[PDB]
């Protein structure tokens with residue numbers, strides 16, 4: 001079933017019928033005119049270049065016959081170079097969680113999927129660069145507060161109830177030069193939002209089910225890298241605990257973000273929003289928060305009318321929203337982050353109020369497990385504020401962050417950090433964030449605290465706000481110890497791991513996450529494996545995960561049962 005269409009910037013004529021390679025279309029405007037149907041295909045010729053063009057699709061596939069957008073022929077990825085074209089009217093239909101977040105306006109999107117479901121897009125190169133001749137904003141400054149929002153791929157659910165099955169696979173998205181500031185317009189590489197339906201009684205509550213972003217490479221996109229799920233129904237999630245009933249009715253179900261690479265992201269690299277049990281795995285980010293600094297992020301944003309969303313004449317402090325983390329969830333239920341790498345989340349020293357690789361933000365049941373991080377400008381993990389609850393941070397490896405590993409920034413409830421290995425760079429003399437206050441509780445068990453340096457590190461306060469508990473941790477090369485009745489205290493020169501501090505400082509040449517889930521793997525992380533007679537061996541306690549995540553395995557995929565070793569390796 002369905003019709004295959006062909007488009008060639010090279011060979012095509014828009015007066016052709018576009019249904020054979022011999023008679024292809026010339027411009028994407030021909031596809032934009034169609035109402036697409038189950039089994040339909042849109043094949044862009046390799047070597048093609050669609051300058052000042054865009055795909056704004058209409059129609060929908062079926063579960064058995066999705067629409068496919070893909071390639072034919074041979075040569076370079078077909079290129080969609082939108083250059084500030086592809087205009088459409090974004091309108092959430094009501095203000096967002098902060099009345100200052102912009103929620104209506106004209107947006108430029110290279111690809112727009114608005115109420116298109118059962119669709120798969122693969123193999124394309126996409127840009128939305130501000131640097132060309134006929135660019136609608138001409139020589140407007142890249143960091144003006146009223147620069148138009150820009151997307152590589154924008155998704156909108158609104159007037160078709162639950163949208164099912166949107167797949168973006170192997171897209172190369174670069175030079176999306178969006179608004180430097182705006183968090184919740186479709187503004188950055190890939191951004192999926194949910195708008196208030198015209199008539200919710202008629203079409204049903206708008207939400208997503210089955211959204212797969214996989215094998216994509218993003219470079220120099222702003223503000224967001226990949227964001228999925230910001231919804232008009234944000235006001236249905238204002239409790240600390242998030243019910244399965246709220247999440248299934250209003251939240252994004254079956255969201256998988258996997259095997260993506262991101263470089264030079266202006267703000268946050270990857271964020272799931274209002275998502276029920278999202279899976280975020282095998283992603284690599286480096287050099288994110290590129291524009292979260294006092295040079296780029298330098299112009300004030302308007303105060304918006306709490307009803308109309310129109311500027312009031314008032315302006316915010318330039319610092320508003322001048323924060324970003326690497327790969328993290330917002331108002332998700334039982335989000336799992338596993339097998340990710342995050343390097344150099346930038347700019348905590350020049351106006352980024354955050355800069356952590358990992359941020360268990362407001363939400364319920366976040367589990368970070370079997371992740372690696374290096375050279376981030378803030379602490380390895382933030383637990384953010386009084387609605388960040390039921391947190392598990394386990395079997396992760398962290399080295400050479402520009403702060404100590406822990407940022408419990410006023411988090412609440414059950415917070416468990418266990419079986420991690422933290423390589424703390426020389427001269428930090430702390431395990432805590434340097435300004436967020438460290439007021440929230442943590443239950444700290446079975447962790448390696450490995451202090452690099454020629455002299456023992458000092459830690460002035462092991463128990464800020466009095467609500468830190470410790471059991472069965474290992475402390476290497478530090479001059480004092482917390483209240484841990486089962487502490488393993490280790491002096492400089494006693495080996496604990498094979499080559500502590502020898503984790504990678506850079507992404508793989510092929511930009512893929514280095515797998516470590518089968519313990520027959522030799523990996524670039526093997527310097528964190530325990531030596532024969534390591535003082536970590538058999539010194540941990542059996543963990544009870546009070547968030548309901550049973551202990552299964554270590555960082556490396558070794559089964560864990562009985563009395564565990566201290567740290568990320570069994």
Ligand SMILES: CC(=O)N[C@@H]1[C@@H](O[C@@H]2O[C@H](CO)[C@H](O)[C@H](O)[C@H]2O)[C@H](O)[C@@H](CO)O[C@H]1O
Nearest residue numbers: 097098183273323324325330354361384385
């Ligand atoms: C509670 C808090 O302040 N969290 C910070 C995040 O800011 C929130 O982000 C959500 C995203 O959907 C909304 O924009 C909300 O209005 C913001 O309060 C922030 O994005 C992250 C990343 O730097 O850090 C937390 O500090």
